[PDB]
């Protein structure tokens, strides 16, 4: 068996790679000394490069990733060596070698656990360099780069500097321009990146990202209002990074919907102490979408109501409360008042009306189940809710 793998490796080093890869992985000391040959080969090829050796490098990277996946101090050394050998070849600029190297680095980094202090400056600069020049790339290179970024963010938890996310959510960042791809896979990986960034336990590094997202949403909303011949609003969550910018109608709508969908990472959390609460942001800050934007752009209103309903249904509509308990001592009243005001309107859409009715029915059925919610029938919001239901 020691020499049997040599023939398979030689054959695979030449669409059939999946079969040999699976066979080798299912087939299974010697690997420790065997990886040295590949490492030396890559180093020698990189040194001699300074252009037909690219296919060989790609094949070697693929076989190396397959053998390592078939399966604690040399991991950092090997990772640094691979990163240096990959970054050295900065002349040919081949997409195959870059994709293979990205996959190899991702699996190597994922092999360990986020319980060490490995060198992060090299990985961060490598990811940023690859992202800064991945605009007009192939459909696979973009996905590989995004996956690598997600893995890097997840691996480095609470240790990522604020500058990492500060330059990642700015208009000049290419990440914001990668979500416009027509393929659903690109949008999915982009959303995954946003989810991973927003799923951090470090409040100081997450506050800047949250503020940047809110600023972008405010800029898009202001652009829509200006294009609809109406004054701007939501000046309490504006950002300096988006002081002067232009967003098209379709672009603004897409950006607002994407940000609202991305906010579900923190909105649907299972227990994040930020200044603008998600509930207050979707119930009081974004109150202009129901005045005039609900007629020309009902999608934004529907998305806001849907995310608010999804966030409230996971906490039993905040009935027990009516630290966390004291902070949410006035949520049911606000929900009832909002439902009553929205239902009493006469300029609602079919989808919006159906969603509001479903929410109202769920809240009502909920009201009488307890025998302890009797005092909740005297507050004025309940009267407004009943009036809306009757009207």
């Amino acid at each position: 068996f020691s020499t049997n793998f040599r023939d398979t490796v030689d054959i695979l080093v030449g669409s059939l790679t999946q079969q040999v890869s699976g066979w080798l992985q299912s087939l299974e000391a010697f690997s420790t000394t065997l990886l040295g040959q590949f490492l030396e080969d890559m180093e020698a090829y990189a040194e001699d490069l300074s252009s037909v050796s690219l296919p060989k490098l790609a094949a070697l990277l693929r076989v190396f990733s397959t053998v390592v996946r078939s399966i604690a101090y040399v991991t950092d050394v090997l990772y640094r060596v691979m990163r240096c050998v990959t970054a050295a070849n900065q002349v040919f600029f081949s997409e195959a070698v870059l994709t293979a190297a990205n996959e190899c680095v991702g699996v190597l980094l994922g092999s360990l656990d986020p319980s060490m202090t490995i060198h992060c400056d090299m990985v961060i600069t490598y990811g940023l360099d690859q992202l800064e020049n991945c605009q007009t790339c192939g459909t696979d290179y973009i996905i590989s780069v995004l996956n690598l970024l997600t893995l890097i963010v997840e691996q480095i938890n609470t240790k990522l500097p604020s500058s990492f996310v500060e330059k990642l959510f700015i208009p000049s960042s290419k990440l914001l321009f990668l979500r416009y791809h027509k393929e659903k896979e690109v949008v999915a990986v982009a959303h995954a990146v946003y989810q991973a960034v927003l799923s951090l336990k470090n409040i100081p590094v997450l506050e800047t990202a949250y503020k940047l997202i809110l600023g972008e949403m405010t800029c898009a909303l202001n652009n829509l209002l200006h294009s609809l011949q109406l004054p701007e609003a939501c000046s309490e969550i504006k950002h300096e990074a988006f002081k002067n910018h232009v967003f098209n109608v379709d672009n603004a709508k897409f950006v607002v919907i994407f940000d609202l969908s991305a906010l579900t990472t923190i909105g649907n959390a299972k227990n994040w102490a930020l200044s603008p609460t998600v509930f207050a942001l979707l119930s009081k800050n974004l109150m202009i979408v129901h005045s005039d934007l609900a007629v020309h752009f009902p999608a934004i209103q529907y998305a806001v109501l849907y995310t608010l309903y999804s966030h409230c249904t996971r906490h039993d509509h905040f009935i027990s409360s009516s630290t966390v308990t004291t902070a949410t001592k006035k949520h049911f009243s606000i929900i009832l008042n909002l439902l009553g005001i929205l239902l009493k309107k006469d300029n609602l859409n079919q989808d919006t009306r159906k969603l509001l009715m479903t929410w109202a029915l769920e809240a009502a059925v909920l009201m009488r189940k307890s025998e302890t919610y009797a005092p909740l029938f005297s507050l004025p919001s309940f009267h407004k809710f009943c009036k809306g239901l009757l009207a």
């Binding site: 007629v295 999608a299 309903y309 249904t313 859409n349 079919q350 159906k354």
Partner: protein, 310 residues
């Protein structure tokens, strides 16, 4: 001693597929006056038969196999052929006449005529023009069904047909029906462009394509003010066939198919019925007038003039 004459169960053939008159509808006609005539026009797969059936004596919850007007079957779509041939006839209990129509300039008829003028190509165009003129001179209203927006060739055809019509001029109302609409087409921004294009493309059509059948007042758009549109033409959109939080359905962005169908039917039935000729006509009189008009259109002179030009 006042029971109705009879009830029609299925539509009949008013004109044979060979462009021949079929006098077989007098058995269901009376001597009453103030009759309404509705006609339809469109391409091959627009869905004129389904619309006519749903608007005359059918419901969306019913089945397509029992419709008053035969619809295209699944086995026919794969072959790329047409279903409706000639002109149909059907009258509801409210004494409302409905007239169907075969596709105009459809490749199915052309292919069927290949294995059967200078070339067998202008014949289809002339048949379409004949049907359009006939529907424009003996019908109270004509509904144009379009599969997609802005074909750019239907407007020219309509103008040419009205220019070669047989004959203080009478011009029936024109309705623009956009079948198989999507969410993107149910936005005010797109609606303004649609109305603007329709108005600019038919500035000198002489037809009554505005001032009636305004979907804006039919509660379709709750908060859309009437002044938001420079000129609201008669255009209607028909969409495609259609613990508690997890059961919420998908977001379509457009009203229900049944609601829009019912609204369209009500608006069509509540339309005006202006006089056709310079005298009052009854059901039997209208039938005879239509027969005479068709006979005159067949052996007309303008058609020959247009024929020698192709």
């Amino acid at each position: 001693k006042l029971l109705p004459p009879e009830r029609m169960k299925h539509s009949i053939k008013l004109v044979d597929d060979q462009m021949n008159w079929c006098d077989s509808a007098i058995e269901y006609l009376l001597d009453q006056t103030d009759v309404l005539v509705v006609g339809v026009l469109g391409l091959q797969g627009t869905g004129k038969s389904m619309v006519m059936s749903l608007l005359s004596a059918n419901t969306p919850e019913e089945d397509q196999r029992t419709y008053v007007f035969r619809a295209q079957s699944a086995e026919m779509k794969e072959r790329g052929g047409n279903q409706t041939s000639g002109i149909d006839f059907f009258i509801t209990q409210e004494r409302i006449v409905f007239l169907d129509t075969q596709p105009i300039l459809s490749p199915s008829i052309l292919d069927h005529l290949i294995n059967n003028y200078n070339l067998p190509h202008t014949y289809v165009e002339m048949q379409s023009l004949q049907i359009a003129a006939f529907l424009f001179t003996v019908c109270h209203v004509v509904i144009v069904v379009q599969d997609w927006f802005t074909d750019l060739s239907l407007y020219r055809f309509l103008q040419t047909a009205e220019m070669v019509k047989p004959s203080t001029e009478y011009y029936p109302h024109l309705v623009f029906l956009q079948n198989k609409a999507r969410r993107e087409d149910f936005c005010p921004r797109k609606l303004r462009q649609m109305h603007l294009m329709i108005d600019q493309l038919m500035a000198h059509s002489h037809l009554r394509y505005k001032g009636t059948l305004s979907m804006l007042q039919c509660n379709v758009f709750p908060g859309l003010p009437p002044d938001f549109l420079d000129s609201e033409v008669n255009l209607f959109l028909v969409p495609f066939m259609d613990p508690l939080f997890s059961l919420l359905p998908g977001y379509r962005g457009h009203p229900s198919f049944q609601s829009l169908v019912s609204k369209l039917r009500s608006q069509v039935m509540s339309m005006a019925r202006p006089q056709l000729s310079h005298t009052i006509l009854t059901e039997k009189n209208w039938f005879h007038y239509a027969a005479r008009i068709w006979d005159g259109v067949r052996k007309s002179s303008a058609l020959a003039e247009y024929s020698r030009l192709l």
